[PDB]
Design an enzyme around this catalytic site. Structure first.
Site, short mmCIF file in Angstrom:
data_model
loop_
_atom_site.label_atom_id
_atom_site.label_comp_id
_atom_site.label_asym_id
_atom_site.label_seq_id
_atom_site.Cartn_x
_atom_site.Cartn_y
_atom_site.Cartn_z
N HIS A 40 0.72 -1.29 -0.18
CA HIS A 40 0.71 -0.19 -0.37
C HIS A 40 0.80 1.35 -0.01
O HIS A 40 0.13 2.32 -0.74
CB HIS A 40 -0.74 0.68 0.99
N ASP A 84 0.19 -7.53 1.98
CA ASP A 84 0.49 -6.51 2.11
C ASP A 84 2.08 -6.12 2.25
O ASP A 84 2.01 -6.36 2.98
CB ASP A 84 -0.61 -5.24 3.14
N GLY A 175 2.44 6.65 8.26
CA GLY A 175 2.95 7.13 7.75
C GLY A 175 4.71 6.33 8.33
O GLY A 175 5.76 6.24 8.49
N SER A 177 4.19 2.79 8.41
CA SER A 177 2.65 2.19 6.86
C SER A 177 4.77 1.56 6.36
O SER A 177 5.63 2.62 5.66
CB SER A 177 2.06 2.88 5.83
N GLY A 178 4.47 0.54 6.44
CA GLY A 178 5.72 -0.90 5.39
C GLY A 178 6.74 -0.25 6.26
O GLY A 178 7.43 -1.45 5.90
#
Ligand SMILES: CC(=N)N1CCC(Oc2ccc(N(Cc3ccc4ccc(C(=N)N)cc4c3)S(=O)(=O)CC(=O)O)cc2)CC1
Ligand SMILES: [Ca+2]
Length: 223
Positions: A40, A84, A175, A177-178
């Site tokens: 994402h 994801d 923020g 994320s990942g």
């Protein structure tokens, strides 16, 4: 990261910031040429920033390297967030040292109860927004599948786990994320999604990386 703490410069040496003119996602360095992040987070024009602490100040240990290729998981579903995960290859190998270091892929999944370290430059507020410039960290236990399921109005899959604190106040956020979820020195998770941040009974959800180790190794080997 809400209700976490300032990590300390380069204490999370595998933590990467993905930058497209500004930090937009975290990721994890899994070897000198590859970063794993969330699907994402995908976008074009990614520069990988390694060795970062303060993402707004050049402090002397950064390596900035553009991505040559991004590979979103073949079955990534942006509606359900299933799978994801994304791999990003660097145009050139990072130089690995104490402040820039890869994180090991897991060989076994982590179990509920396991404490993990989640980090990122995401929002630090549960209500409203404030984005830190230094890396934030949070230790959070993996929660049982049953409580994860009870805690979500969304369909959860076996490719996700949730971690955090049902009482609220401590969670990853937008923020982050990942970014990595590391448990016992292994990269077990990727900051994937949550309903709000740090809300009661709304724990963070994480891509269950141990399910993707074969894809990851095969993809890296072939690319
Ligand atoms: C499971 C599922 N089906 N999903 C995932 C959830 C939902 O998708 C999203 C995706 C992103 C957001 N955003 C917030 C957001 C983004 C990332 C997070 C990561 C972790 C955590 C957490 N607490 N651990 C909360 C997060 C919340 S958003 O796009 O920024 C909304 C906006 O534009 O302001 C909000 C909802 C719908 C799709
Ligand atoms: Ca910096």
């Amino acid at each position: 990261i809400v209700g976490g703490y300032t990590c300390g410069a380069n204490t999370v040496p595998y933590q990467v910031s993905l930058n497209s003119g500004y930090h937009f996602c975290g990721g994890s360095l899994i070897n000198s040429q590859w970063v794993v992040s969330a699907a994402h987070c995908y976008k074009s024009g990614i520069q990988v920033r390694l060795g970062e602490d303060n993402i707004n100040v050049v402090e002397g240990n950064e390596q900035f390297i553009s991505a040559s290729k991004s590979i979103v998981h073949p079955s990534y579903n942006s509606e359900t967030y299933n799978n994801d995960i994304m791999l990003i290859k660097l145009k050139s190998a990072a130089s690995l040292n104490s402040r820039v270091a890869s994180i090991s892929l897991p060989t076994s999944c982590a179990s509920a109860g396991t404490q993990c370290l989640i980090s990122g430059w995401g929002n630090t507020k549960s209500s409203g927004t404030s984005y830190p410039d230094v890396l934030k960290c949070l230790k959070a236990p993996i929660l049982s599948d049953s409580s994860c399921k009870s805690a979500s109005s969304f369909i959860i899959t076996s490719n996700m786990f949730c971690a955090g604190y049902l009482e609220g106040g401590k969670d990853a956020c937008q923020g982050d994320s990942g970014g990595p979820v590391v448990c016992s020195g292994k990269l077990q998770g990727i900051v994937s999604w949550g309903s709000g941040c740090a809300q009661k009974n709304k724990p963070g959800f994480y891509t269950k990386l141990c399910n993707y180790v074969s894809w990851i190794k095969q993809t890296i080997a072939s690319n």
